[PDB]
Design a protein around this ligand. Structure first.
Ligand SMILES: N[C@@H](Cc1c[nH]c2ccccc12)C(=O)O
Ligand SMILES: N[C@@H](Cc1c[nH]c2ccccc12)C(=O)O
Lengths: 250, 250
């Protein structure tokens, strides 16, 4: 895919390849984060000892918002595949802007599920992948930086549902128009679900978990499957139906 | 290992485990960077189009130095296992400092091979792992951030030779004292080389390259072996002999 050549983007085979490559990215990052304890103090707002001068929020929030401000200055969020966790904080680039042709509907930047993602990550994913419960006082920064890597990968994968939805829309405008016009969510869901393909994904995930990071001479497959089945796939679909419901300007 | 409990640190079995875990980390990061072209413009100082207001250096340098300043404020370089690429730029922490007991010799922060590492990474490693030659104008930031991940992993692995050297020193002070006193480098090299173990490492690396990121239903083993054999292991040894030669205060 080349975000300056629209045809490489709305191409369904290029989309599968990118989704499959993100699958590995996400698995590698979960393995990196699994080496550390849960570190509850990292996600708690204004924790004594991890309190940042003139900042209201958690240790995780400071590290992530600061990273976004720096990257926004170098054009990160000008790209259609990048959605920010702190939309109010991002700056304008100090480098010549890349001219990205409009590929998605105009309101695309407004379809943003990062709050929900950050939330389920902390409340549901951390507890399954961490090595143990409790704070590891000497690894708060190691943890936060690994968390940022996991969040940015999940975010890109989940919001990639926008390109999936646009490809589908364009391939059958008459059908989608009627579904959108009558706001038939059940009809849309049924058209964006291929149960056969979803089983296949889960089966491949189980086999990757079995070999990845395992010394040939780290993460439970059951949990990897639970995460994709209960969190990743379902939220990707929410992004797709919301993108679609507003497709005829909204 | 717990950098607040010296015995967990100079323990040789805890050291193997940490080295083996970094082996996976490094392999995963090489795979992430392999998806992009060489991007020569990223490493060139003051490139037209990637020129940063009031900054002399490359795009890579700006991203990396800025990251270090932010992390230094949250105590990254207070930890003995973290060595900075920009020692002159790092700040003092605005959080209560962690009291790390002196585990390594005092001059330890001065043994820093990051310039050499950054250099061989650009000149020798990039060309072997990149997908193709040339600039990918729309992925300069994606590349730089992947480069930072690779550099920080290699840096931690290579400078980990300081702990290896201190463990050895402490286990046979009479022997090491004579080697150090007469500055016998050849004698030191011969005592820190177990050829049998080095073959074994290379063999395991070949088998990891064969399964990692390969869909069960990315990086050449030959190149992975060349990198560890010609760059990683040799520079780790340079860190160890330099740390040792200054051991009796220097
Ligand atoms: N492990 C140490 C040092 C550290 C490693 N990576 C970091 C990133 C940011 C801040 C600190 C760190 C800590 O968590 O404190
Ligand atoms: N791929 C785009 C956007 C991007 C992704 N990650 C980044 C990190 C920093 C800056 C930009 C980016 C680019 O390289 O420009």
């Amino acid at each position: 895919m080349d975000f300056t050549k629209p045809e490489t983007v709305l191409n369904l085979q290029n989309i599968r390849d990118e989704l499959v490559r993100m699958e590995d990215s996400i698995i590698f990052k979960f393995i990196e984060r699994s080496h550390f304890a849960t570190c509850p103090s990292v996600y708690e707002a204004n924790h004594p000892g991890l309190e940042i001068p003139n900042f209201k929020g958690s240790f995780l929030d400071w590290a992530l918002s600061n990273l976004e401000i720096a990257h926004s200055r170098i054009r990160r969020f000008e790209s259609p595949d990048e959605t920010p966790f702190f939309p109010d904080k991002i700056q304008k680039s100090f480098l010549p802007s890349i001219n990205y042709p409009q590929i998605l509907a105009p309101y695309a930047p407004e379809v943003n599920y990062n709050d929900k993602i950050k939330k389920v990550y902390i409340e549901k994913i951390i507890p399954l992948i961490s090595k143990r419960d409790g704070d590891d006082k000497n690894n708060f920064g190691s943890v936060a930086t690994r968390d940022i890597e996991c969040l940015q990968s999940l975010s890109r994968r989940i919001h990639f549902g926008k390109f999936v939805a646009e490809a589908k829309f364009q391939s059958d405008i008459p059908l989608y128009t009627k579904l959108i016009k009558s706001k038939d969510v059940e009809g849309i869901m049924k058209n964006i679900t291929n149960s056969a393909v979803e089983e296949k994904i889960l089966e491949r995930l189980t086999k990757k978990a079995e070999v990845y990071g395992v010394d040939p001479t780290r993460i439970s497959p059951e949990y990897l499957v639970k995460i994709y089945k209960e969190i990743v796939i379902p939220i990707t679909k929410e992004v797709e139906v919301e993108y679609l419901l507003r497709r005829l300007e909204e």
